[PDB]
C-alpha cells in the first residue's frame, strides 16, 4: 500500500471496497453530561474518541534538539511492540495501533502483538460479533492477536505477550496512547549499546474529556511514596541532585529510581535474567515498583528517554475495569520483599494489612533474590534514590500518637488522612487515626496513612511540599515549633492554636513515640 512519512506501514484499515474498515461516529451530542460520558467510557469520553479518526495527527512533543539526531535503521535491532488490553474500546485500541504502525519504520518493527486479557466486550470476544478480528485482516501481517482465555491481569497479560515476542527487544505500550515521531529509535539505540538498560519514554497527556494533546505527562526522574506508588521528583528533591544533573540537556538520558509501568523497552533475554515479572502479582497495581527495585538491585539500569515521547489518556472520573480490592494490597506486600527493613514503614503506612500474599510463593522469590546476588534496599536508597526524604529509617525518628498529657488527648486525623481537612483532639485509643510520623529532612508531620498530607500551623492537613510552609521542629522539651515563625503548637481549651514558645507551659508539651524499627522485617502470618 501507499507508504510514506506519517504512514510508514502504508494506508491502514482500507477494504478492497476502497472505504475504511471503521465507520467513524458523528460529532458527540450537544446534550452530553461529561461526568456521565466519562462513566460510559470507563474513564474517558468515548463519544469524542469514536468521532476522531484513527489516523489522528498528534503534535511533535519532542524538544527541537531531538529532531537533529540521526538514526541508522540498518544497524538497529528489531523490536516487538506489545499492547495488552482488557475491555478497551475499539476507537482507542485501534488508534494506538494506527499510531504505532504509522509512526514506526518497518525496518525496526518486528511485530505488533495484541494481548486480549480475557475481554468480555462483544467486539473482542471470540464468540462475539468479530469486529476486531475482521478489522485486523485489513492491517499488516506484522499485527498479531493472542488471547488469555481468562483475565490474568497486567503481569499475566504482559508475560503472555513478552514470551510470544520474537525480537531481541520488546516494547510495552498501554492500549490508549499516541506516539510522537521517532518514538522507538531512541529506545533501540540505547539498549543496543547495553542490554542491561530498561529504557522508558517520557509520557505526555491526552485529555480524557476533550482529547487535547498536552505537553507534560509524567517526566523523567521518578521516586516513590511510602504508600508504594511512583512519585515524580518534587522541587526540593531535584535540588538535592548533583548540580551537573539538576538541569540536564533535553537529549541526555537520565536514570530514574522508578518507572511509571507499562511504557518501557527492554532486551528480552536480560528481562528474564533479571527476574522478569513476579507472576503472582494479581490484576492491577504496583508491579512497576517491584520491577524497579528488583532492576536496580540485581544489575540493571532504569533510564528515561526525553526524546521518546508517547501520549497517554489518564483516566479521569472513572475507571475502565474492576480489580478485586485485595489484589492491590497483595501486590504491595510482595513488593515489600525488596524493601528489606524499610518494609516496616511501608507496611505501617498502607495500614498494617494482614492479607494472603501467597507466602509460599514469595519464599521462592526470596531464594531467587539471594541466588542472584541482588543488593539491599539500603544500597538502593543511598545510591539510586539518595534524594528521598527517608534514606535510612533514622530519617523517621518519631512514629506514634502525638499526645498532650495536660488535657489527656491525642491528635486525630478525624477519619480522613487525606489532605484538606482539619486535625482534632480526641481521647487516645491507639488506632492508626491517631498515629503521626516525622520526616526530619523536611520537618514534615504526617498521618502515618498518607505521606502526602502534612500538618500546618493552621491546624489543618494539606498537600506536602518541601518548603518552609510545612517545616516543623520537635524540640527536646516536647514542643511542636513551626520553624518559620518560631511559635509552638498548644492544645489549650481542646483547640489547636499557635502560641509563644514556653517550655514551662504544659499545654504545648507533646509526647511522641520514637520509631526504633527492627533490623529485619518479619512478614505477617496468614
Amino acid at each position: 500500500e501507499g507508504a510514506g512519512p506519517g504512514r510508514l506501514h502504508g494506508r491502514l484499515g482500507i477494504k478492497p471496497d476502497g472505504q475504511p474498515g471503521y465507520t467513524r461516529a458523528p460529532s458527540p451530542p450537544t446534550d452530553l453530561s461529561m461526568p456521565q460520558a466519562l462513566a460510559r467510557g470507563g474513564g474517558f469520553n468515548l463519544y469524542l474518541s469514536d468521532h476522531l479518526e484513527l489516523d489522528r495527527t498528534a503534535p511533535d512533543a519532542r524538544h527541537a534538539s531531538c529532531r537533529q539526531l540521526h538514526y541508522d535503521l540498518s544497524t538497529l535491532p528489531k523490536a516487538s511492540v506489545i499492547i495488552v488490553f482488557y475491555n478497551e474500546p475499539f476507537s482507542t485500541l485501534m488508534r494506538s495501533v494506527h499510531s504505532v504502525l504509522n509512526g514506526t519504520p518497518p525496518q525496526i518493527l518486528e511485530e505488533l502483538i495484541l494481548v486480549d486479557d480475557g475481554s468480555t466486550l462483544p467486539y473482542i470476544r471470540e464468540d462475539g460479533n468479530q469486529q476486531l478480528v475482521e478489522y485486523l485482516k485489513l492491517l499488516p501481517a506484522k499485527v498479531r492477536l493472542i488471547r488469555n482465555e481468562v483475565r490474568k491481569g497486567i503481569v499475566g497479560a504482559r508475560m503472555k505477550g513478552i514470551r510470544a515476542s520474537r525480537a531481541p527487544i520488546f516494547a510495552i505500550l498501554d492500549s490508549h496512547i499516541e506516539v510522537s515521531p521517532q518514538w522507538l529509535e531512541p529506545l533501540l539505540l540505547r539498549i543496543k549499546e547495553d542490554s542491561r538498560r530498561v529504557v522508558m519514554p517520557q509520557i505526555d497527556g491526552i485529555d480524557a474529556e476533550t482529547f487535547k494533546h498536552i505537553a507534560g505527562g509524567i517526566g523523567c526522574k521518578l521516586g516513590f511514596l511510602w504508600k508504594l506508588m511512583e512519585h515524580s521528583y518534587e522541587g526540593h528533591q531535584t535540588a538535592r541532585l548533583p548540580p551537573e544533573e539538576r538541569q540536564p540537556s533535553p537529549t541526555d538520558f537520565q536514570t530514574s529510581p522508578a518507572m511509571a509501568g507499562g511504557l518501557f523497552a527492554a532486551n528480552k533475554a536480560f528481562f528474564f535474567d533479571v527476574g522478569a515479572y513476579d507472576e503472582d502479582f494479581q490484576f492491577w497495581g504496583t508491579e512497576n515498583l517491584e520491577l524497579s527495585f528488583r532492576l536496580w538491585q540485581c544489575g540493571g539500569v532504569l533510564e528515561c528517554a526525553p526524546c521518546s515521547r508517547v501520549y497517554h489518556i489518564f483516566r479521569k472520573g472513572g475507571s475502565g475495569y474492576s480489580s478485586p480490592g485485595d489484589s492491590i494490597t497483595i501486590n504491595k506486600m510482595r513488593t515489600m520483599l525488596w524493601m528489606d527493613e524499610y518494609a516496616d514503614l511501608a507496611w505501617r503506612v498502607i495500614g498494617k494489612p494482614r492479607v494472603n500474599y501467597r507466602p509460599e510463593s514469595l519464599e521462592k522469590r526470596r531464594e531467587w533474590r539471594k541466588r542472584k546476588g541482588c543488593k539491599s534496599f539500603r544500597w538502593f536508597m543511598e545510591n539510586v534514590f539518595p534524594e528521598g526524604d527517608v534514606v535510612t529509617l533514622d530519617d523517621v525518628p518519631y512514629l506514634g500518637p502525638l499526645r498532650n498529657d495536660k488535657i489527656g488527648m491525642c491528635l486525630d486525623n478525624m477519619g480522613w488522612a487525606s489532605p484538606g481537612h482539619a486535625v482534632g483532639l480526641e481521647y487516645c485509643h491507639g488506632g492508626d487515626t491517631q498515629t503521626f510520623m516525622f520526616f526530619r529532612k523536611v520537618g514534615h508531620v504526617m498521618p502515618v496513612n498518607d505521606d502526602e498530607a502534612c500538618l500546618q500551623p493552621s491546624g489543618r492537613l494539606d498537600w506536602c511540599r518541601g518548603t518552609a510552609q510545612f517545616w516543623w521542629d520537635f524540640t527536646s522539651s516536647g514542643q511542636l515549633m513551626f520553624r518559620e515563625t518560631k511559635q509552638c503548637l498548644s492544645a489549650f481549651g481542646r483547640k489547636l492554636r499557635m502560641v509563644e514558645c514556653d517550655d514551662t507551659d504544659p499545654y504545648q508539651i507533646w509526647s511522641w513515640t520514637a520509631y526504633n524499627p527492627p533490623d529485619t522485617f518479619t512478614f505477617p502470618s496468614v
Partner: peptide, 7 residues
C-alpha cells in the same frame, strides 16, 4: 486502576 499524571 489509574496512574496519575505528573503535576
Amino acid at each position: 486502576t489509574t496512574t496519575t499524571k505528573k503535576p
